Write an enzyme that holds these catalytic residues in place. Structure first.
Site, mmCIF file in Angstrom:
data_model
loop_
_atom_site.group_PDB
_atom_site.id
_atom_site.type_symbol
_atom_site.label_atom_id
_atom_site.label_comp_id
_atom_site.label_asym_id
_atom_site.label_seq_id
_atom_site.Cartn_x
_atom_site.Cartn_y
_atom_site.Cartn_z
ATOM 1 N N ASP A 35 48.234 7.492 -30.722
ATOM 2 C CA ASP A 35 48.891 7.634 -29.223
ATOM 3 C C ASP A 35 48.387 8.776 -28.632
ATOM 4 O O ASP A 35 49.103 9.901 -28.710
ATOM 5 C CB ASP A 35 50.231 7.450 -29.398
ATOM 6 C CG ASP A 35 51.098 7.385 -28.157
ATOM 7 O OD1 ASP A 35 50.133 7.312 -26.945
ATOM 8 O OD2 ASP A 35 52.148 7.797 -28.086
ATOM 9 N N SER A 199 40.344 9.577 -11.475
ATOM 10 C CA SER A 199 39.408 8.683 -11.146
ATOM 11 C C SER A 199 39.198 8.346 -9.820
ATOM 12 O O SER A 199 39.871 8.911 -8.667
ATOM 13 C CB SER A 199 40.216 7.178 -11.502
ATOM 14 O OG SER A 199 39.097 6.024 -11.179
HETATM 15 C C1 LIG Z 1 57.967 -0.343 -29.923
HETATM 16 C C2 LIG Z 1 56.807 0.279 -29.833
HETATM 17 O O1 LIG Z 1 55.844 0.178 -30.813
HETATM 18 N N1 LIG Z 1 56.577 1.296 -29.034
HETATM 19 C C3 LIG Z 1 55.472 2.172 -28.546
HETATM 20 C C4 LIG Z 1 54.453 2.459 -29.350
HETATM 21 C C5 LIG Z 1 53.588 3.447 -29.094
HETATM 22 C C6 LIG Z 1 53.394 4.196 -27.627
HETATM 23 C C7 LIG Z 1 54.506 3.845 -26.855
HETATM 24 C C8 LIG Z 1 54.655 4.351 -25.472
HETATM 25 N N2 LIG Z 1 53.562 3.859 -24.959
HETATM 26 C C9 LIG Z 1 55.504 2.611 -27.301
#
Ligand SMILES: CC(=O)Nc1cccc(CN)c1
EC number: 3.4.23.22
Length: 330
Positions: A35, A199
């Site tokens: 992430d 962008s």
């Molecule tokens: C429930 C779940 O997996 N939420 C999640 C995962 C990864 C990132 C985010 C925020 N964009 C939320």
């Protein structure tokens, strides 16, 4: 050093991507959601409230000979979808695609919200935003990338997400066989802790390019592309029967539609998102109303170049002293 790991969609819609990560000694392999919009590496664990675990693989620090409790440290995080998790912290050895970091902060969940429990495919998150967003208290911890950076051949990682297919995260090198043409680099602001960039504009389908600055973040942990309401309206106006539904929570369109592409600018370069990438399927099983992959950022406070956009490109996250982002077609 370098690392290279395959990342795989969790479902047929590419709702998220999971990448195997080795934690501890002997290795415990968990499938984590990488992430670039957050900065905590947290996992389902042997400490997670039992009723909140449903099919995930857990990290058990007591079975790792290299795990050490980070005494007094706790963490708690909330995400843009309303989900959350919290717990305590260990340090342990973490490896991704052959790249190893010793003493990585591994945040062990004691509690997770319902959406995490309900998704059996994601065993935790691996944050790749800037370490200034890390939530560990009272001593903030570094991301896997920050810890690895000095050892890497080059201080970079790359995201090459697939459309309805596996892709790759590389650390420490740029695979020049993985993209076409050149990589266009653009400035990053780290002021909010994100890979935040501007962008240079957009086009809908075969339409003319609109030159306009759109500030947003490159976020592998967000599924969709969230843009200003003006841009999103211009897109969906080209799809017969598309409308914004407050009850569904965004733009929906007839499943019988053929969607136009969407182009975004990176400097003078252009990344084209094919129309099919913007289809997120029936709003509920059996419905002929489909959910759109481009949605308004108006409720959010920031524009988000999530997976819909990123999967159309080879993306370089350049963590040099002055960070930058690079985008290439592929
Ligand atoms: C429930 C779940 O997996 N939420 C999640 C995962 C990864 C990132 C985010 C925020 N964009 C939320």
């Amino acid at each position: 050093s370098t690392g290279s790991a395959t990342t795989t969609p969790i479902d047929s819609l590419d709702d998220a991507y999971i990448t195997p990560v080795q934690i501890g000694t002997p290795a415990q392999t968990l499938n984590l959601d990488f992430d670039t919009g957050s900065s905590d590496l947290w996992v389902f664990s042997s400490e997670t409230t039992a009723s909140e675990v449903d099919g995930q693989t857990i990290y058990t620090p007591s079975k790792s000979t290299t795990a050490k409790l980070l005494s007094g440290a706790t963490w708690s995080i909330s995400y843009g979808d309303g989900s959350s998790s919290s717990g305590d912290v260990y340090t342990d050895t973490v490896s991704v695609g052959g790249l190893t970091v010793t003493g990585q902060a591994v945040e062990s969940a004691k509690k997770v919200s319902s959406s995490f429990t309900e998704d059996s495919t994601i065993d935790g998150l691996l944050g790749l935003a800037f370490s200034t967003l890390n939530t560990v208290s009272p001593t903030q911890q570094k991301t896997f990338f920050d810890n690895a950076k000095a050892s890497l051949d080059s201080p970079v990682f790359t995201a090459d997400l697939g459309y309805h297919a596996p892709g790759t995260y590389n650390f420490g090198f740029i695979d020049t066989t993985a993209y076409t043409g050149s990589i266009t680099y653009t400035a990053v602001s780290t002021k909010q802790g994100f890979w935040e960039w501007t962008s240079t504009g957009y086009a809908v389908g075969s339409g003319t390019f609109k030159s306009t600055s759109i500030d947003g973040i490159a976020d592998t942990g967000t599924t969709l592309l969230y843009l200003p309401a003006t841009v999103v309206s211009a897109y969906w106006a080209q799809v017969s029967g598309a409308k914004s539904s407050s009850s569904v929570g965004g733009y929906v369109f007839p499943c019988s539609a053929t969607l136009p592409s969407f182009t975004f600018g990176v400097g003078s370069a252009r990344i084209v998102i094919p129309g099919d990438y913007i289809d997120f399927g029936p709003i509920s099983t059996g419905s002929s109303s489909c959910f759109g992959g481009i949605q308004s950022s108006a409720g959010i406070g920031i524009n988000i170049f999530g997976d819909v956009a990123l999967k159309a490109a080879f993306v370089v996250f350049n963590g040099a002293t002055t960070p930058t982002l690079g985008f290439a077609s592929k």
